[PDB]
Amino acid sequence: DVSGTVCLSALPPEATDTLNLIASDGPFPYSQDGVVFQNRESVLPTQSYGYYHEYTVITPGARTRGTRRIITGEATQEDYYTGDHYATFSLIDQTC
Amino acid sequence: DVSGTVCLSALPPEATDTLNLIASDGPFPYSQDGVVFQNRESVLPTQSYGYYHEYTVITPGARTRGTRRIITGEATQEDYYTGDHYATFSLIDQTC
């Protein structure tokens, strides 16, 4: 289940950075940016393989890619944030 | 993010000195000159560890290393100036 909606303004600023890169199709900072997200644990609605893609949201100060991601679906503005390495997701509302 | 490009001629003269030392591979005045800059806060573009190195830009009169630096990247002509101890950066344009 998607745990609600979150305003874009409420997320870390790097989430805005990631969305702006998704809009331009990159170039992306990481080679893993834009891979398919398999939705293994069925947290997001079930779709055919390839429907969802994942992108890094940089965490300043982290030594790795960290745990923050944006997952896109194919519908307009269907963008989900996770800050906990895919345990929970929120739909992003870009209007607030 | 990088805050734009600045001509070398518009930076303190000490920045020209530091760039000349980088071109000759030293000798450098400070022991810390040439160490890797980790880019921990993700202000500069994400790159592999060791892509960036740091060099002192002397501040006249200072007893310490002060707050001015050049950060080199591995690409041709990729040099960044900070006058505020890594909070902000500008790309240096050696052509002007």
What CATH code is carried by the domain that includes residue A53?
3.10.450.30
B53 is catalytic: no
Catalogue the active-site residues of A.
54, 85
Q: Do B41 and A61 touch (CB under 8 A)?
A: yes
Q: Please, which residues have CB within 8 angstroms of residue A20's CB and are 6 or more apart in sequence?
A: none
Experimental method: X-ray
- The verdict on A29 touching B (C-beta cutoff 8 Å) is yes
B45 chain-A contacts, CB cut-off 8 A: 29
Contact call for residues A81 and A11 (beta carbons, < 8 A): yes
Pair of tokens at residue B29: 């005045």
Tell me how far apart the alpha carbons of residues A40 and B96 are, in angstroms, rounded to a whole number.
54
Q: In the block, which residue shows the tokens 């992306």?
A: A28
> Please, how many CA atoms are within 13 Å of residue B42, restricted to the half-sphere of its CB?
15
- The verdict on B42 touching A (C-beta cutoff 8 Å) is yes
In DSSP notation, chain A reads ----EEEGGGS-HHHHHHHHHHHHT---SSTTTTEEP--TT--SPP--TTS-EEEE---TT-SSS-S-EEEE-SSTT-EEEESSTTS--EEEETT-
Resolution of the structure, angstroms: 1.2
What's the structural domain count of chain A?
Answer: 1
What's the domain range around A3?
Answer: 1-96
